[PDB]
Design a protein around this ligand. Structure first.
Ligand code: NAP
Ligand code: NAP
Ligand code: NAP
Ligand code: NAP
Ligand code: VS8
Ligand code: VS8
Ligand code: VS8
Ligand code: VS8
Lengths: 249, 251, 251, 249
């Protein structure tokens, strides 16, 4: 019988490439999404057209709140409801915007940035583990985590927390046979609306090819980590950054 | 006059030693506390008996909530209110307890709010309030030397301390053009609870390469004192381990 | 036409597992060895029975000396001689033994072997690899997951492996414009000597979170195979731990 | 009795500042030098002017070779012979120049860069320990070790090995009460031997003050680490970089 995976933030971009590859490898998938309702439903349709009832959608805000634990438990439950099992979790959804130290309130920025990047991953991990052979979790981290963007303290705090979770949960879930790893993009899939000039400014920095990663290149590292070729790999974060994190100021 | 420091969770243990040492160095201090009211007031008295009008207490819960930013703003306000200035922030207060992934009384939302609020979000908000109000200005965050070899079942605590490393770096970078340095001190195992079982105390002490003992609270304070001093004026975004080699020891 | 790979120290154990997996993936292989002549020739024998004229052995000492650069150049030259090309270099050969700081081999010999095999030879093979150049060119270095929790009295071994991390990063950066990717694989504990004590092996096995066992040679090789493959086209300067969580475990 | 310190490469620049500051703190010093004979002697003269019989010189090449262990043993010996004890070792001497992967022979470059930055520190550490209060060793590391300068492979390899030594020796010498730590400068003391497009270029990247560190600021960290205020600190590397290592490309 086919394994099943939850991908958070799977409607668009990297999340979508990850769900597509997982599906192409034989997985059934829960396409989680927040606002991108048309993209998610149409993705699930494209995949079900390929193989009947191998995709379902699941909408949820992953901002930190009193209701997040229940929401995360329901995302995991949706995988069991659809597919009767949950073998892989990909924590991909992420809020990303600056939060300078000097019209959202700060407590909302905290809830979105720390919720999506760290707290929701933790809660989903808890539910994933509680509801349980090649089980694993892949967390989407950030290659530049130690050379942070200016004014992005909460985002960066969130991504650091996520490293912490990857390690802590690898240690704690190893006895249940659940591996926990990360993939750390550098710059990938620059926004379509971003001017090519500014796109080129990031591209120029990348040693390998002076270009951004494709979403599929990030997905490839995920597929490796969930494969049986990574059976002894846990607590590892693989950078897929074309050398960007190695470049000094 | 004399510079002023805020020390969070300053009523007892390591925070208290840092307050004591900053006060001996010539600082006026805000002793923040949450539950340890007696110990706090008793410390303020002792420090004011030593030099009058040089310590105050400030009570606040540093659990995450929608009012945490106001509470952090009021802490930095209480320093200006009492001393006219705020030169040093020490982010020391911290909740620490297990939060297993596979199953007190506490709800997980409470665990999240306490562990992530005290270790990460309040430091961030206090750092904002500190910078917004603004010499040798700096912030010191109490990190954890064991943050990449975490205690079993301490996920949220570890996520917190990892976040605090990220804040230390992000705020060092962002606040440098305001001449505010941001650094960390990372203890290994330090000041074991007097009430902890002797067998367990020994098990911790035996692990430490340098002297087979825990750090004193004073030893931790010494590194804080260095980082706020004029001998550390080019130092920002650095985290100094004060761990006797503990983090170096393999399984 | 099949790509070609050089594997250092490939007569046995992890190096052999890597050579075999590359060969099955379609590569022609140079099996480098130092003392294990019989094991190397035998491996090349097998692989040639599988596909003729797809393996050769190459003998070299990788101890540091004034001729080491020529020896490394001759290793790379030996791939071009046998196969007309050299696509992949795996730096796997390694001396490993204690070198205590306080007290047959002279310390000069210790430095030469430990720093030579683990770091300088990899640097010189990388130079010759780049100099002697469709393509998916890369280098994989066999690193060590426990590099920051070192074994007692293994200073020179640990310095070597740390230098290898530096090389991995430095070469990733510098050879990126040439299309040459440079990455690492960092085993924890893998392949215990058949005649290590039943107690000593079990002591190592029990430390490992994931399965309480050492990695197989195949498992290390799997990670090498990924990094050389087109599934890793954007990955350079990455070191993948393959350690079953061992590096995360505090003492 | 006054404690004694060996400082390698102490005739000029950061090494000289460390010797001065240690001497100012009450140490007797051995001033090691390789080529800067006039400056070394001038410094010893100046410190002995302050306090008689508190400074001596020792000459040695720290390039790797068959004679380097004996050379390192004699450096430590010069401290015992002059002063009757050796409480502090500062490994500061360092060769630094580009060694492109694609003049000196390569093997000479290896000997120099790996010898000064790693192997001499290791041998000096063995000699120091073998001859044994507040004993410690401070290794001058590099804050930019993970974002290395282009074409500086051997130098970066040497500095990485030095981190390794720092950690390994911290662990192994802890039972003898010998602490082992590091100080990692970012940019410090730009030569007048440097264009000012180039100097300005480096200065402009430093978040804290848009300037290099003074040699004295580097020395301040060494002083702290050797002091009684760092009694529990071992295996720690303190960056003194004005935040340079945190600045992304
Ligand atoms: N792109 C890069 O260069 C880069 C660099 C470093 C790290 N990464 C990491 O890689 C992952 C993929 O990157 P990306 O650029 O593809 O991500 P992205 O497009 O910024 O975000 C992915 C998705 O996250 C979901 N999301 C955002 N806020 C949410 C909320 N409050 N609740 C629930 N879901 C929410 C969104 O869903 P809806 O659209 O459905 O609302 C969004 O489509 C992220 O974890 C990112 O941080 C990416
Ligand atoms: N001790 C160690 O071995 C060790 C090891 C690694 C890291 N560290 C770090 O070093 C710092 C000091 O350690 P420690 O053992 O002295 O700390 P601790 O005794 O565990 O905590 C210090 C204080 O934090 C305050 N605090 C806790 N929860 C709070 C809340 N919700 N709101 C406001 N304040 C709260 C408490 O104040 P009241 O008592 O006033 O309620 C407590 O006295 C901590 O950041 C810790 O994480 C310590
Ligand atoms: N096994 C583990 O648990 C583990 C852990 C961490 C890292 N690693 C790394 O993984 C790699 C493979 O491990 P392993 O256990 O398979 O290694 P190994 O058995 O210790 O060594 C592999 C080969 O290195 C070659 N070698 C040794 N000294 C040499 C010299 N002076 N010149 C040339 N070649 C020399 C030897 O070749 P001959 O037999 O031909 O003389 C030896 O067979 C190493 O780089 C190791 O450091 C392994
Ligand atoms: N300056 C910076 O921005 C910076 C940045 C990162 C790290 N650091 C580190 O901090 C330390 C001090 O930096 P610096 O700029 O003061 O260093 P430096 O001037 O480049 O070198 C210090 C001394 O090293 C000695 N030396 C070089 N090659 C030697 C050899 N083969 N044998 C013996 N001694 C040799 C020289 O002594 P003679 O003059 O007597 O020949 C030289 O004066 C070094 O370890 C350096 O790598 C500095
Ligand atoms: N969730 C999330 N989304 C991101 N970008 C998305 C792009 C689609 C619109 C929502 C924001 C990034 C970017 C990004 C990605 C591209 C360019 C610059 C930064 C980065 C990113 C890139 C370089 C250095 C540090 C962070 N992280 C990220 N995380
Ligand atoms: N806020 C906080 N408090 C701590 N301890 C306090 C002790 C008094 C009651 C509140 C909890 C620790 C400890 C601790 C400190 C001593 C022993 C073991 C772990 C550690 C700690 C020690 C070794 C390895 C990892 C963490 N962190 C910590 N953070
Ligand atoms: N080149 C090389 N060879 C190794 N092992 C070989 C075994 C065959 C005879 C030469 C030495 C190791 C080991 C080893 C591997 C297994 C057990 C303990 C350490 C380790 C190793 C294992 C755990 C923690 C730190 C180092 N590295 C290594 N590097
Ligand atoms: N032994 C030594 N010497 C150095 N500089 C000295 C300068 C006097 C002539 C001998 C070489 C550096 C420099 C240096 C120092 C200043 C500017 C740029 C790099 C650096 C350095 C600076 C930035 C990033 C990485 C390294 N390391 C170093 N190590």
């Amino acid at each position: 019988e086919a394994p099943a995976a939850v991908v958070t933030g799977a409607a668009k971009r990297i999340g979508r490439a990850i769900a597509v590859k997982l599906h192409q490898t034989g997985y059934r998938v829960v396409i989680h999404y927040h606002n991108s309702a048309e993209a998610a439903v149409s993705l699930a349709d494209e995949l079900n057209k390929e193989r009947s009832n191998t995709a379902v959608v699941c909408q949820a805000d992953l901002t930190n709140s009193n209701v997040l634990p229940a929401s995360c438990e329901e995302i995991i439950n949706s995988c069991f409801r659809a597919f009767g099992r949950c073998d892989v979790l990909v924590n991909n959804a992420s809020a990303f915007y600056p939060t300078p130290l000097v019209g959202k309130t700060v407590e909302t920025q905290v809830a979105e940035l720390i919720g999506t990047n760290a707290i929701a991953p933790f809660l989903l991990t808890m539910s994933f583990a509680q509801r349980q052979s090649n089980l694993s979790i892949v967390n989407l981290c950030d290659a530049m985590v130690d050379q942070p963007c200016m004014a992005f303290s909460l985002y960066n705090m969130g991504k650091h927390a996520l490293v912490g979770l990857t390690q802590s949960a690898a240690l704690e879930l190893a006895p249940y046979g659940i591996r926990v790893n990360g993939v750390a993009p550098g710059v990938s899939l620059l926004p379509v609306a971003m001017g090519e000039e500014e796109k080129d400014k990031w591209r120029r920095k990348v040693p390998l090819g002076r270009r951004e990663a494709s979403a599929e290149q990030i997905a490839d590292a995920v597929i490796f980590l969930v494969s049986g070729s990574a059976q002894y790999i846990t607590g590892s974060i693989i950078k897929v950054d074309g050398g960007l994190s190695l470049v000094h100021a």
